[PDB]
Design a protein around this nucleic acid. Structure first.
Ligand SMILES: Nc1nc2c(ncn2[C@@H]2O[C@H](COP(=O)(O)OP(=O)(O)OP(=O)(O)O)[C@@H](O)[C@H]2O)c(=O)[nH]1
Ligand SMILES: [Mg+2]
Lengths: 283, 174, 74, 104, 140, 247, 123
RNA sequence: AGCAGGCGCGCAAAUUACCCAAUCCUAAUUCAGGGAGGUAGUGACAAUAAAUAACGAUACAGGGCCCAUUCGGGUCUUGUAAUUGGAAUGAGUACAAUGUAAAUACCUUAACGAGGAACAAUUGGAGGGCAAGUCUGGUGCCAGC
């Protein structure tokens, strides 16, 4: 089997790429719950935060940064399922995508458009979550829908991807066994380098304040192009600290930075580096 | 197991016309059916060649040849008069696959074509005495050749008429 | 007001030649190949087709004088 | 055997060889310069169907295989021993018949 | 082999980069390389328009990417294009469409062209039905 | 719990799980005994599954050669009796023409005793002569004309000896073990090497002069008058081809 | 109309049962409805409808007949004492369901092996 | 130091399921237990069985069919038409029963379930032909890609 021994170690050899993800303060890997309207997202977010920090979250909004495991943390984002103007830049920023399908309906064209946008703009780690298995007692049809969805999904994304199935919701949160065997996977995540997120300094905003003078807006009369503080969390290549950098935030057009400032970290490092925990802003 | 075997060459003109004639004559599905019947024919007459090449009056040749001809007359591919061992050597694939249930119910009648025979006995209508057989490749034994009739729980026998007939009776009696 | 996916995106095929309803079921294609080749060799031999069916209406298709389809012994 | 023992080798495309060939679907148009990774060398691969040449652009981590002509053609060049069978994870036959989608 | 040679090259580059980064803090953290990765930072922008803060919604994400020195200039750009194979209708030239070219997303008017056997670039009145073609448009 | 290659004269079903029963320590060896699980589960089929066999063993219905022996894996091997008090049954398990454990339905007056070959005659303690037998019933005070490789007739109410068959040239014999199993008749030749490989040769209705190891043979009684009954025509193995030629 | 027919009947006073093979023949119906079968078998024998048991059914191919195994006891108390619990809960006479199934039972077993203490627990 | 799930590079395949019901085994010992073991899920590695259609009726058409290095040979008993008709079904779907430790599957089975039977079979391979179109060569109107 020397031919197989020389033929299966060609899986290793790829294009050499560079990473720039330093091993001292790795960012929360932004994952992005996206899919159809209605099904999934908010209850899956509530289940993941209830199993990762043992505390519920009612009326969630905006990006959370929860902690999972010892070293590193991660970031959730309920992307709205009605606009490509959020779907596109979520697929441009995201690193994992736990992607919702509903098995009593087949696929849906919002997750179709999301998977095509991801396939073009640079493949994140995709992971399918097939929810809504209120199908019937006919476990033959349950196995049939899961089999056809798995084969269609493995054609659409890489063949062999994980497709976690969820049953019905037990009073707001998902079945905790399935949330356990999903959370163990996204703790053993193992991401990959991509050229766009290793060539551009990119940041997801999670707090948004307007430090413009109230007397000034009250004497100008709702006309000014104000000044705005984005309290956020950068990923990727180092955003250069000198003010004057052109930074485009999405959906309004570009600006230049005025001043930036490093803050106390609102998420855990290891406690030995502390000496020598869900953080849910915009809420 | 590995019943069927690929022949000594599968891309050849005479073999291609062989499979074309046999398939279109006995109403067959693919080359695997001819290859299965041809294989087991080759196996039993390869076993018959050794019993021929050893001498007569050996107990091996005597009652193993009697065993082989009893099994072959039980399947029915050997006539009642040629009960000696070299007619097994002179066997052929045509009167060996002629005893399958498709061809046999077409010969018995009741089907009006070989292909209609195949599609009805896979639509579960023909029962050898008591047992409904829904498979063509049966090789029906000689004793149960006269027990072929439409099964009683099927509307070509004497059951309730089918769903097409009673649905048309409903929406033509409305 | 809920979307769905259509047939070609569900099946994920496309840009193929027009294939054949005869080519679908192999038992049918190995029937419509035989009964053509059954009618092909009414043009290389003259096969037996029952015989004198009606009354003898003549040979009905032409007899020619200068033609001998008899294999001769060298 | 043509490259050590393996039947397929992942490779990095340098540049589409012969974009300026005027005759469409020609031999000098359907070549790419692949950097073989298993020993780090250059080779000239032969992607079929110039209409599906333009999937591969530049370091698309392409996967080669042998060619093996079953006769003699009209204006085919010799020397190309390698054809493209898979590009960046997917198979470009499936890409050219537009089932899958090229990921980037 | 060659791939482990290239990986050893870039990883030794990153290692010597870190080993001469691990130095005095005002230069080597925030004025020679500037907030590497994973730093909760506040940014301010003046001249941000009103409707952003007037009707900001907490549901929608606010991503922000920096620009390289080349991707603030304007002018034409020549891309390759293809009708996405499940779109039921083909793309006529001078019909505007939204693009996710990089960070910016923008409606622009393209012109689909093709090199007629690679001698000149003439304007098509329609995109081809299943294969690629060149295209040119004003944009970032 | 090592199994699935049992002694294949037990004839257990192979699609019956994976394992096969381990006979415990007892009066007979491993591969020449037959435990009551294999007996009452797939040899005469009075109980379906092994825990039901444990139920009929625990409920005192079965006794092997006199006393109850409430145990599943009890290796009740050759020549003993099994007096099922209900069903009035006396299973003596003996051998057959082919190598299996044939059963009987013994009368009570014959099931009241059993026999067996001795293995040694010794002087145990305080100058007491005691003999053994093949099923471990080391019994004291024999008649001292008991020789090695001879049979005594145990009374099975007490452990006393009622009679013995002093084997010599010419008294009716059984066999056990080896490829000449289940044969009778003792009168052709009596060979005695030095180190085994010897037999009292056999004479039957067809007078087949046969031999085996002397460890693989033991006695029954007088010619034509045996002490034990024997199953299915007092097993001979003439020929199945001659049987299908005659009848 | 169906029929039942028993064969291979052997008495067995080692359990005071009679065990046999049951052939039910139904010309058009699906299958023979084990509760109704059980009361019919206890009617044709002299049994209880509680001391008769049938388990190993299989409908043979093409429909029409079904073959299975069949038990009739006597002394309904002895039927309780001899037939296993899964059969005795398939009939409605004795129930057994416990919540600590495998995982929440064995984790409780291992932690209770770790406990070593009774209800004296003051902190 | 085994089961399940992982890691083993950035590009890859089973579940962190059920259970002592079977076979055995251990213990004071029928009764407790056993990731020994069994059951189920996933599973184009392999193997066997075979459904995607079957039978009729009608209409015109013949400058038409088919075969053999060529001229020859033989044939409406040859093709195109929803012109069109009713019959039979299981893939499914599903009361129920069956199986089983319980449950799935199969085996049964009432009521549904077919015309483009769209209830949509693929993978290859050999040829063409078409423009107010494109390109290269030249001994016009051509040859090639
Ligand atoms: N029966 C059943 N209901 C579900 C299941 N999953 C979600 N639902 C229902 O779907 C409803 C919507 O919940 P979410 O999915 O959290 O709503 P959302 O994520 O905010 O989606 P949007 O409102 O469109 O943004 C819930 O109230 C659930 O009752 C499921 O698996 N089974
Ligand atoms: Mg929501």
């Amino acid at each position: 089997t020397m031919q197989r021994s020389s033929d299966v170690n060609e899986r290793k050899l790829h294009v050499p790429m560079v990473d720039r993800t330093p091993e001292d303060d790795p960012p929360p890997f932004i994952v992005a719950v996206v899919g159809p309207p209605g099904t999934g997202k908010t209850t899956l977010i509530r289940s993941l935060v209830r199993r990762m920090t043992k505390s519920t979250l009612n009326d969630i909004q905006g990006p959370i940064t929860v902690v999972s495991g010892k070293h590193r943390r991660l970031t959730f984002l309920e992307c709205p399922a009605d606009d490509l103007n959020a779907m596109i830049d979520i697929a441009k920023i995201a690193d994992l995508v736990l992607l919702l399908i509903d098995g009593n309906f087949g696929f849906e064209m919002e997750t179709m458009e999301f998977l095509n946008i991801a396939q073009h703009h640079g493949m994140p780690r995709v992971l399918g979550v097939a929810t809504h298995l209120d199908l019937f007692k006919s476990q033959s049809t349950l196995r049939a829908s899961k089999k056809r969805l798995k084969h269609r999904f493995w054609t659409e994304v890489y063949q062999g991807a994980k497709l976690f199935y969820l049953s019905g919701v037990i009073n707001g949160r998902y079945p905790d066994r399935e949330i356990l065997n999903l959370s163990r996977f996204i703790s053993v995540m193992k991401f990959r380098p991509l050229k766009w997120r290793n060539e551009h300094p990119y940041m997801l905003a999670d707090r948004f304040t307007d430090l413009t003078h109230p007397e000034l807006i009250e004497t100008q009369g709702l006309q000014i192009d104000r000044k705005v503080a984005i309290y956020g969390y950068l990923h990727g290549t180092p955003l250069p600290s000198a003010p004057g950098t052109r930074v485009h935030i999405a959906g309004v057009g570009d600006f230049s930075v005025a001043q930036i400032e490093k803050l106390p970290d609102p998420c855990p490092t290891p406690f030995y580096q502390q000496k020598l925990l869900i953080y849910a802003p915009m809420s | 197991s590995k019943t069927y075997s690929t022949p000594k060459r599968p891309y050849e003109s005479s073999r291609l016309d062989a499979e074309l004639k046999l398939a279109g004559e006995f109403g067959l599905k693919n080359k695997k059916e001819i290859y299965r019947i041809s294989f087991q024919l080759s196996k039993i007459r390869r076993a018959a060649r050794d019993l021929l090449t050893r001498d007569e009056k050996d107990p091996k040749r005597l009652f193993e040849g009697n065993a082989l001809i009893r099994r072959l007359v039980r399947v029915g591919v050997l006539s009642e008069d040629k009960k000696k061992l070299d007619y097994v050597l002179a066997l052929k694939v045509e009167d060996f696959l002629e005893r399958r249930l498709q061809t046999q119910v077409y010969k018995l009648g009741l089907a009006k074509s070989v292909h209609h025979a195949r599609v009805l006995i896979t639509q579960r209508h023909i029962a050898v005495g008591k047992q409904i057989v829904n498979i063509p490749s049966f090789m029906v034994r000689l004793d149960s050749e006269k027990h072929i009739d439409f099964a009683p729980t099927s509307p070509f026998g004497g059951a309730r008429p089918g769903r097409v007939a009673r649905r048309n009776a409903a929406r033509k009696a409305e | 007001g809920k979307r769905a996916i259509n047939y070609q995106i569900l099946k994920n095929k496309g840009l193929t030649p027009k294939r054949n309803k005869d080519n679908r079921n192999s038992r049918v294609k190995k029937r419509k190949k035989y009964q053509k080749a059954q009618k092909k060799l009414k043009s290389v031999r003259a096969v037996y087709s029952g015989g004198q069916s009606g009354v003898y209406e003549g040979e009905k298709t032409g007899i020619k004088k200068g033609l001998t389809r008899s294999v001769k012994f060298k | 055997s043509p490259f050590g023992g393996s039947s397929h080798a992942k490779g990095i495309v340098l540049e589409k060889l012969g974009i300026e060939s005027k005759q469409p679907n020609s031999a000098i148009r359907k070549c790419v310069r692949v950097q073989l990774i298993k020993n780090g060398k250059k080779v000239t691969a032969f992607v079929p169907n110039d209409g599906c040449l333009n999937f591969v652009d530049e370091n698309d981590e392409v996967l080669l295989a042998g060619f093996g002509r079953k006769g003699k053609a009209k204006g085919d060049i010799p020397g190309v021993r390698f054809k493209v069978v898979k590009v960046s994870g997917v198979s470009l036959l499936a890409l050219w018949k537009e089932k899958k989608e090229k990921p980037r | 082999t060659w791939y482990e040679l290239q990986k050893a090259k870039i990883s030794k580059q990153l290692e010597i980069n870190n080993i001469e980064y691990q130095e005095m803090t005002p230069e080597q953290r925030q004025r020679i390389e500037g907030f590497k990765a994973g730093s909760y930072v506040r940014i301010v922008f003046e001249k941000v328009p009103m409707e952003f803060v007037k009707n900001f919604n907490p549901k929608f994400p606010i991503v922000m990417g920096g620009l390289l020195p080349t991707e603030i200039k304007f002018g034409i750009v020549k891309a390759r294009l293809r009708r996405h194979r499940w779109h039921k209708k083909i793309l006529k030239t001078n019909d505007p469409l939204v693009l996710s070219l990089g960070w910016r997303r923008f409606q622009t008017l393209p012109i689909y062209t093709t090199t007629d056997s690679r001698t000149r670039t003439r304007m098509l009145k329609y995109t081809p039905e299943h294969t690629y073609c060149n295209a040119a448009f004003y944009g970032p | 719990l090592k199994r699935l290659a049992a002694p294949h004269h037990w004839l257990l079903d192979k699609l019956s799980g994976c394992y096969a029963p381990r006979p415990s320590a007892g009066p007979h060896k491993l591969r020449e005994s037959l435990p009551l699980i294999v007996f009452l589960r797939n040899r005469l089929k009075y109980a379906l599954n092994g825990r039901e066999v444990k139920a009929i063993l625990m409920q005192r219905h079965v006794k092997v050669d006199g006393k109850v022996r409430t145990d599943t894996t009890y290796p009740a091997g050759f020549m003993d009796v099994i007096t099922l008090d209900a069903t009035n049954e006396n299973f003596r398990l003996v051998y057959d023409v082919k190598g299996r454990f044939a059963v009987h339905r013994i009368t009570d007056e014959e099931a009241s005793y059993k026999l067996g070959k001795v293995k040694k005659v010794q002087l145990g303690k305080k100058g007491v002569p005691y003999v053994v037998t093949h099923d471990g019933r080391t019994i004291r005070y024999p008649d001292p004309n008991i020789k090695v490789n001879d049979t005594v007739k145990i009374d099975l109410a007490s452990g006393k000896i009622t009679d013995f068959i002093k084997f010599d040239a010419g008294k009716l014999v059984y066999v056990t073990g080896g490829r000449n199993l289940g044969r009778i008749g003792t009168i052709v030749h009596k060979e005695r090497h030095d180190g085994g490989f010897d037999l009292v040769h056999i004479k039957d209705s067809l007078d087949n002069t046969f031999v085996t190891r002397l460890n693989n043979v033991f006695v029954i009684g007088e010619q034509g008058k045996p002490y034990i009954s024997l199953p299915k025509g007092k097993g001979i193995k003439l020929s199945i081809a001659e049987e299908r030629d005659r009848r | 109309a169906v029929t039942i027919r028993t064969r291979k009947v052997i008495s067995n006073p080692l359990l005071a049962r009679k065990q046999f093979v049951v052939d039910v023949l139904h010309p058009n119906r699906a299958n023979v409805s084990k509760d109704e079968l059980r009361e019919k078998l206890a009617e044709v024998y002299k049994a209880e409808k509680d001391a008769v048991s049938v388990f190993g059914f299989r409908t043979q191919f093409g429909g029409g007949k079904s073959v299975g195994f069949g038990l009739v006891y006597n002394s309904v108390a002895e039927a309780k004492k001899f037939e296993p619990t899964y059969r005795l809960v398939r009939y409605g006479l004795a129930e057994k369901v416990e919540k600590a199934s495998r995982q929440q039972r064995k984790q409780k077993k291992n932690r209770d092996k770790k406990i070593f203490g009774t209800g004296k627990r003051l902190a």
